[PDB]
């Protein structure tokens with residue numbers, strides 16, 4: 001529950017940073033969100049989907065598969081906004 005609130009706070013900060021065009025701030029906030037996701041999702045079908053899609057995106061990034069990274073990141077943001085009820 002505190003972890004869920006920390007995650008919601010990062011999701012909102014990411015939205016503000018993206019709205020401002022602050023891509024390096026988006027980068028570092030995503031790194032923080034990653035830290036919290038690895039801890040929170042180390043359950044419901046959505047929780048399992050977030051864990052699986054998060055893992056897939058990291059494998060895609062490690063393999064340099066950048067189109068899939070972008071699409072996975074978009075989907076993962078959507079899943080996280082649903083799970084944590086972040087508008």
Ligand SMILES: C[N+](C)(CCCS(=O)(=O)[O-])Cc1ccccc1
Pocket residue numbers: 053071072075
């Ligand atoms: C619903 N998905 C699991 C995709 C399902 C197969 S489809 O993209 O061909 O429709 C979401 C999704 C997951 C990872 C990347 C992009 C989308």
Ligand SMILES: [Zn+2]
Pocket residue numbers: 033034035037054058
């Ligand atoms: Zn991550």
